[PDB]
Structures are given as structure tokens and as C-alpha cells.
């Protein structure tokens, strides 16, 4: 059960960092999208 | 350790569902940006 715990914490933390990386990209691309759409 | 595994596993599935949905939204917005840029 300790072996399952470390796998669960690492999978959760890796997912959280990837989700934050995508969220910053979405904010960047949607800002470009509305400017490009206006032009 | 068992209560830590339940909490760690719960935030892993919660993060994974948000991250997968966000990745599909990124792909959708990038495809829409590519189409609008071509126009």
C-alpha cells in the first residue's frame, strides 16, 4: 500500500503540472485568436 | 497510508479528467486558430 501511495502522488503531481502548462497555453492561444479574428 | 492513498488517488483522477478535457480544448482552439489564420 506504500508502493501504491507513491505512484498515486507522482501521477497526481505530474497531471497537475501538465494541466497548468496547458492552461497557460490556452490563455496565450485564445488571446491570439481574438486578435486574429478581429483582423 | 491507506487514507493518504485514497486522497492521492482521488486528486489524480480529478486532475486527469480536467487535464484530458483541457488538452482536447487546446487541440480544438489550435485547430480553430489554424482555420481562421488561413481565412
Curated annotation (Swiss-Prot), chains A, B:
Tissue-specificity statement: Detected in primary breast cancer tissues but undetectable in normal breast tissues in Sudanese patients. Isoform 1 is expressed in adult and fetal skeletal muscle and cardiac tissues, with higher expression levels in the cardiac tissues. Isoform 10 is expressed in adult and fetal cardiac tissues, but not in skeletal muscle.
Phosphoserine: modified positions: 3, 15, 35
Subcellular location(s) per record: Cytoplasm, Cytoskeleton
Subunit structure: Homodimer. Heterodimer of an alpha (TPM1, TPM3 or TPM4) and a beta (TPM2) chain. Interacts with HRG (via the HRR domain); the interaction contributes to the antiangiogenic properties of the histidine/proline-rich region (HRR) of HRG. Interacts (via N-terminus) with LMOD2 (via N-terminus) and TMOD1 (via N-terminus).
Domain notes: The molecule is in a coiled coil structure that is formed by 2 polypeptide chains. The sequence exhibits a prominent seven-residues periodicity.
Family: Belongs to the tropomyosin family.
Function of the protein: Binds to actin filaments in muscle and non-muscle cells. Plays a central role, in association with the troponin complex, in the calcium dependent regulation of vertebrate striated muscle contraction. Smooth muscle contraction is regulated by interaction with caldesmon. In non-muscle cells is implicated in stabilizing cytoskeleton actin filaments.
Clinical condition linked: Cardiomyopathy, familial hypertrophic, 3: A hereditary heart disorder characterized by ventricular hypertrophy, which is usually asymmetric and often involves the interventricular septum. The symptoms include dyspnea, syncope, collapse, palpitations, and chest pain. They can be readily provoked by exercise. The disorder has inter- and intrafamilial variability ranging from benign to malignant forms with high risk of cardiac failure and sudden cardiac death.
Name used for this protein in its record: Tropomyosin alpha-1 chain
Biological classification of the source: Eukaryota, Metazoa, Chordata, Craniata, Vertebrata
Gene name of this polypeptide: TPM1
First and last residues shown, out of full length: 172 to 210 of 284
Amino acid at each position: 500500500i506504500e508502493s501504491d501511495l507513491e505512484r498515486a502522488e507522482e501521477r497526481a503531481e505530474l497531471s497537475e503540472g501538465k494541466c497548468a502548462e496547458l492552461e497557460e497555453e490556452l490563455k496565450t492561444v485564445t488571446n491570439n485568436l481574438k486578435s486574429l479574428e478581429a483582423q
